[PDB]
Each structure stands twice: as structure tokens, then as C-alpha cells.
């Protein structure tokens, strides 16, 4: 099971250091439980958050959250189903909101766009619909879902349902003279007249109105197979997929027709699925696949998410995808493998830095809750107390709810905390190296490079990065050889003890690579190196960009500084190595460089970045993965290829103020 995403995290307040955004609406009327993302006529994405379960709602552009005004919509009375007795559609450039309320009323909610978008402080009209029709605390409130022309259908638990035209029903009364059971907990619309529905048990139920009418109660599938509310639910053109209870996730494929095999799912703890989505395949190392299925799922905090690849034949074969369910970012934390990163005072900083303020300032009160006060410097205990606390407020802030496609094919997680999503990237062959070092020529090279570099602490790792960027500084005195600055870092550095036994087996297993062309395939090809607009300014767009080019310079970073390494240990000839051996020396120089400039005011360096490799310099719009990929290889380019030669004193200041 090979890992081929990575989790790259945007937190759309991240760059400010002030959340929430400056311009906050209230309307009223009289943590998070639910957070989606619904594309608009006008090609903007909208996010809502629904907290407690009702009475509240939010809205926010996710290209501009923090100059953008967040609409908050306060509510009388809770939903009656909290947030499945809702419906978000955009008709007559209007957001169209319904709800059921505990009172049994029912709602709806007219936004213009122009509101949303529009720097607006509030926004004078009526948009209260309050209604009471066609609903009794007779029969209780459930499951609302949008029909195409303005039109909506109800569910109530009695197996049941009452249509809205506001009142009109279908014909099914059923009256046990021997003997409530079932329910209804799924449904999606075909085509444009048939509403396939699910059931407590589950089975499924097909429609046409042909008001009452229907093929029955295929309770499926019932049958099919393994003899014993939410989104088990996903159609794709005249495919569906629907998923079972047991014993494992069983995932039935069901395709007028309704016939079908299903698959399996991987597991071992408990997950739930939190959202399903069936579309066209995406670039993926495999032969050919007919269908791609994304899905999510959630065991408490921790999410995981999977993309099922399908063969035509509709399952000729099938293959599970993977995904790193971390962030870079967040593993280097925890497997304390950040190199880069620099007292109390500048620690203190550094996390700040590396989580948006939204988190720090929600950590800093929670610890004031909690009576945990700081004596400044060497307060450490506090804040030993601290790291922690961020870790937990961001995998809380990051527990997914549900799933966006940034269409084209990018795939977009939704978080409970308003401002943080999570979007899955498609690794470039360098990323999948390093995320699957485990799985079983070059791959090998590097896992033998990792395996010895692994077992130096990362003192000895800082110690020699250093001593590789004063080579370029020329802190190493130039008049020396290649081999003579090699030496003396050795025997400043690594001199210590590194176990001798395991060098040798970094000796023997390097005798087995023609290494001066695995060289050549990992530097000309693999490292080392059209677009739409970017017009206004995103925002969202910014964070991945700058998020993707970390990751992807990070990791350079670490086979960078590993190959140099073995250039110290073993002294090959420097006569052979020499263009290699120059450019890595210029790469790594490069790559601590803006390892720290992230460090140190993101936003900046973002603006930077985007201005340079931007037409209107607000950066290029992401359709399509290939695409994504090519920006950040561009950006990629971009920093390889800079002038590193200062021109005046002041670019050295830079410099050095930074090498300190």
C-alpha cells in the first residue's frame, strides 16, 4: 500500500497576524460541526460552518478570508436534524438557505452574491421566509434534499416523506396492524427525474413522480453477499457506488440497470467514513483505471483518506491508494527531524511561526484557563506545555467534516474550525521516495543514503550543513582544496563517533550503484528543472503554493545534505565529482536559504515568490494536479536558479544576518 498524496495544510489566516479577518458581519434573526465548500456562478468558493447545531452558520471566501468579510447568520431555534435539515444552493445568483427548526418552522435565506462579496458592513431587506406549513410535531423532522427548480424534498423517520412546493405528498400509508423500524439515511438524484434513495438497514429505494412510485425496495442487496445518516452515497454519470455496514466496509457497486459486485476495505481500529466522492481518474502511477473513488474517513480526530482506482469492466481489477495523513510539517515536529530551525525568547517566535496565530492565540488562552502562567526566559517548563497544546488545538482544528473537489480533480478537506482546510497533493516521483522509504535503483541509492544519515543526531546534521554553506560564504578559505575543506569537515564533524559499523555497510551497499549516473539521474533529471492569471489576488491559491514549495524544498534539503555527505566521508575524486559536487554545494546554499526565509514572515516570502513568477503577480489558478505540480517546479526553478553573488553590501548583510 503505497502512499502517493501528501496532506498540505492551509490555514487562510496563516499569513496575517490577526484573526480573525478585520470584517466580521452579524445578522441575526428573531469548535464546528459541519464545514463545506460550494462553487459559485461567478468562479469564487464559498465555505459554510454550521456550530451547536443551529443557530449559527457561516460564510467566507476561501480566496480571501482575511480581507474578505465571514458572514455569521445567528438563528432562533436550533434544526430540527441539526445540519441534514439544510440546504445550500445558488439560484438567481442568490444563496438559497433552508432549514427545519426544533419548532418545527421551516426556513429560508436569501444572500446575494453581491452581499457575500461586497465589502458591505449589513445588508438591509428581508430575508426571513418563516414558515410553519405542512409540518407537525405529528411527525418529526429529518432529512432535507434540494430538487433542481427551487424544488425540496423531506424525509421524516416514519419511513417518509412530504414534498415542498410552498406542502405535497407522496402516496405511501402504511398502517401495521402487527407492527417504528427502518429509516432513511442516504439519497442522490439521477439524471433529472429519479431520487435513489437509502435506508436504515440499508437498501435502496428508486424514483420518478409519478408522485408514489417506485422499482421497491431493493432492500440491495439484502441478500447479496455476506449473510449477517450520513454520506454513503456517491453517484457518477450511470455509476453508483454505494457503501455497506459490515463486516468490513464492504463498498457495493451497483450501476435503469442496478447490478453490481462489491469491494473491500482496509482496516484494523475503527474508522467512520465522514464523505464519499465518485469521479474521473486522476494521473496516477498504474495501468489503466475506468473510475477514481476519493474517500474519508475519521477515527476521532485523526482522518485518513483513500482513492480507490477502478478498471472499465467496472472492476477488471481494483487498487487502494494511499495517502500521508500528516503534514510535512507536522511529522518534523514530531519526529524531530527539522534541521533548519533555530533561547525561550526565540523558540517562543519559532511556534508562533509554525502555527497560524488563529492556533497560537487559542493555545495561549486555554493555557490561561488553565492557570499555566509564564516566567519569561527559562520558563521553558511553560512552554515545554505549550508545543504540546498547539499540536492538540491544530489536529482539533484540522478534523475533517467533509470533502471539496477544486475541480478540475484537486481534492479539498474541509476542517470544523472555520479558515482550515486540508488539501491532498499528488506527489512528484522525488516525494514519493521520500514518503515510502519502506516499500520496496536510485529509490535504493537514497534509501542507503537515509539509512546511514539516520543514525546521526541531528547536531552532527546542523554542524555539517553549516560547514557546507561556508564553503560558499568562502568562510572556508578558497585557497583550499575540494579534498582539504572535506577533510577538516570531517574531522570536525563527524570525527565523533558515528558507529563504525555502520559505515561499512554504507561502503559495502554504495559499491553496488554506478553512482556517477545516479548522480547525473538525481541532479539533471530529478532535481534540478503557460498559466492562468493570476488576475485578483488568492489567497488560498498563495498558501498551497508556498506550503508545496517547503515541502518539496525540504525534502530536497535532506538528500541534498545526505549525498554531500558521503562526498566527506569517502573522498572520491574530486576530480570526477566536480560539477556535481559544485552544484550541490549551490543547492544546499539555495535551499537553507529559503528553508529560513519560510521560518521567518511566510507572507513575505509568499508575495515574493508570486510576484516574480506571476503575470499580474497574484500567482496562477490550480485546475488541474499537472498543473499544481508545474507551478511549484517553476517556483522550484526559480529559487535554483537565482544569483546567489551579492551586489552590494547590503545583499551580503542579508546574507549573513540570516547564516548567523
Given at each position: 500500500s503505497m502512499a502517493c498524496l501528501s496532506r498540505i495544510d492551509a490555514n487562510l489566516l496563516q499569513y496575517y497576524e490577526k484573526p480573525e479577518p478585520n470584517n466580521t458581519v452579524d445578522l441575526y434573526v428573531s469548535g464546528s460541526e459541519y464545514s463545506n465548500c460550494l462553487l459559485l456562478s461567478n468562479s469564487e468558493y464559498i465555505c459554510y460552518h454550521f456550530s451547536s447545531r443551529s443557530t449559527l452558520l457561516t460564510f467566507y471566501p476561501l480566496s480571501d478570508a482575511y480581507h474578505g468579510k465571514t458572514i455569521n447568520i445567528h438563528l432562533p431555534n436550533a434544526s430540527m436534524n441539526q445540519r441534514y435539515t439544510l440546504t445550500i444552493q445558488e439560484v438567481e445568483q442568490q444563496l438559497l438557505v433552508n432549514v427545519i427548526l426544533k419548532d418545527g418552522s421551516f426556513l429560508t435565506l436569501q444572500l446575494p452574491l453581491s452581499f457575500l462579496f461586497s465589502s458591505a458592513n449589513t445588508l438591509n431587506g428581508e430575508w426571513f421566509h418563516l414558515q410553519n406549513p405542512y409540518d407537525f410535531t405529528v411527525r418529526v423532522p429529518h432529512f432535507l434534499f434540494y430538487v433542481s427548480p427551487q424544488f425540496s424534498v423531506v424525509f421524516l423517520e416514519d419511513g417518509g416523506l412530504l414534498g415542498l412546493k410552498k406542502y405535497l405528498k407522496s402516496l405511501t400509508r402504511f398502517f401495521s396492524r402487527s407492527s417504528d423500524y427502518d429509516s432513511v439515511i442516504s439519497c442522490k438524484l439521477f439524471h433529472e427525474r429519479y431520487l435513489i434513495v437509502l435506508t436504515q438497514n440499508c437498501h435502496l429505494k428508486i424514483w420518478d413522480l409519478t408522485s408514489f412510485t417506485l422499482i421497491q425496495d431493493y432492500d440491495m442487496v439484502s441478500q447479496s453477499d455476506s449473510d449477517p445518516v450520513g454520506e454513503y452515497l456517491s453517484l457518477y454519470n450511470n455509476t453508483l457506488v454505494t457503501l455497506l455496514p459490515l463486516e468490513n466496509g464492504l463498498f457495493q457497486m451497483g450501476t435503469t440497470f442496478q447490478n453490481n459486485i462489491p469491494t473491500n476495505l482496509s482496516a484494523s481500529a475503527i474508522w467512520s467514513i465522514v464523505d464519499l466522492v465518485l469521479t474521473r481518474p486522476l494521473e496516477?502511477?498504474?495501468?489503466?483505471?475506468?473510475l477514481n473513488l476519493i474517500v474519508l474517513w475519521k477515527s476521532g480526530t485523526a482522518s485518513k483518506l483513500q482513492i480507490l482506482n477502478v478498471n472499465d469492466?467496472?472492476?477488471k481489477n481494483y487498487e487502494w491508494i494511499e495517502s500521508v495523513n500528516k503534514s510535512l510539517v507536522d511529522l518534523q515536529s514530531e519526529h524531530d527531524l527539522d534541521i533548519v530551525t533555530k533561547d525561550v525568547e526565540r523558540g517562543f517566535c519559532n511556534l508562533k511561526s509554525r502555527y497560524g496565530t488563529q492556533i497560537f492565540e487559542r493555545a495561549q488562552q486555554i493555557l490561561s484557563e488553565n492557570k499555566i502562567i509564564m516566567a519569561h526566559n527559562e520558563d521553558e517548563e511553560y512552554l515545554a506545555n505549550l508545543e504540546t497544546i498547539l499540536r492538540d488545538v491544530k489536529t482539533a482544528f484540522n478534523e475533517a467534516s467533509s470533502i471539496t473537489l477544486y475541480g478540475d480533480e484537486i481534492i479539498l478537506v474541509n476542517c470544523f474550525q472555520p479558515y482550515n482546510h486540508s488539501l491532498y497533493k499528488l506527489n512528484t516521483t522525488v516525494e514519493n521516495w521520500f514518503y515510502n522509504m519502506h516499500s520496496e535503483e536510485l529509490f535504493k541509492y537514497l534509501r542507503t543514503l537515509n539509512g546511514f544519515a539516520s543514525t546521526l543526531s541531528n547536531d552532527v546534521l546542523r554542524s555539517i550543513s553549516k560547514k557546507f554553506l561556508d564553503i560558499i560564504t568562502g568562510e572556508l578559505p578558497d585557497s583550499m582544496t575540494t579534498v582539504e575543506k572535506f577533510t577538516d569537515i570531517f574531522k570536525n564533524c563527524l570525527e565523533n563517533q558515528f558507529e563504525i559499523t555502520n559505515l561499512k555497510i554504507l561502503f559495502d551497499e554504495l559499491n553496488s550503484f554506478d553512482i556517477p549516473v545516479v548522480l547525473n539521474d538525481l541532479i539533471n533529471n530529478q532535481m534540478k528543472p503557460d498559466f492562468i492569471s493570476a488576475i485578483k489576488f488568492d489567497g488560498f491559491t498563495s498558501i498551497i503554493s508556498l506550503e508545496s514549495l517547503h515541502q518539496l524544498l525540504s525534502i530536497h534539503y535532506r538528500i541534498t545534505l545526505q549525498v554531500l555527505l558521503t562526498f566527506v566521508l569517502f573522498d572520491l575524486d574530486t576530480e570526477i565529482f566536480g560539477q556535481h559536487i559544485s552544484t550541490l554545494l549551490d543547492l544546499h546554499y539555495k535551499q537553507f536559504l529559503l528553508l529560513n526565509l519560510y521560518r521567518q514572515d511566510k507572507c513575505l516570502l509568499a508575495e515574493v515568490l508570486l510576484k516574480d513568477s506571476?503575470?499580474?503577480?497574484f500567482g496562477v489558478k490550480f485546475f488541474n494536479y499537472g498543473q499544481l505540480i508545474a507551478y511549484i517546479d517553476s517556483l522550484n526553478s526559480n529559487v535554483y536558479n537565482?544569483?546567489?553573488?551579492?551586489?552590494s553590501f547590503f545583499m551580503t548583510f542579508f546574507r549573513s544576518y540570516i547564516i548567523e
Open positions: 496516477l502511477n498504474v495501468e489503466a483505471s475506468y469492466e467496472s472492476f506571476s503575470e499580474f503577480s537565482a544569483s546567489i553573488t551579492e551586489n
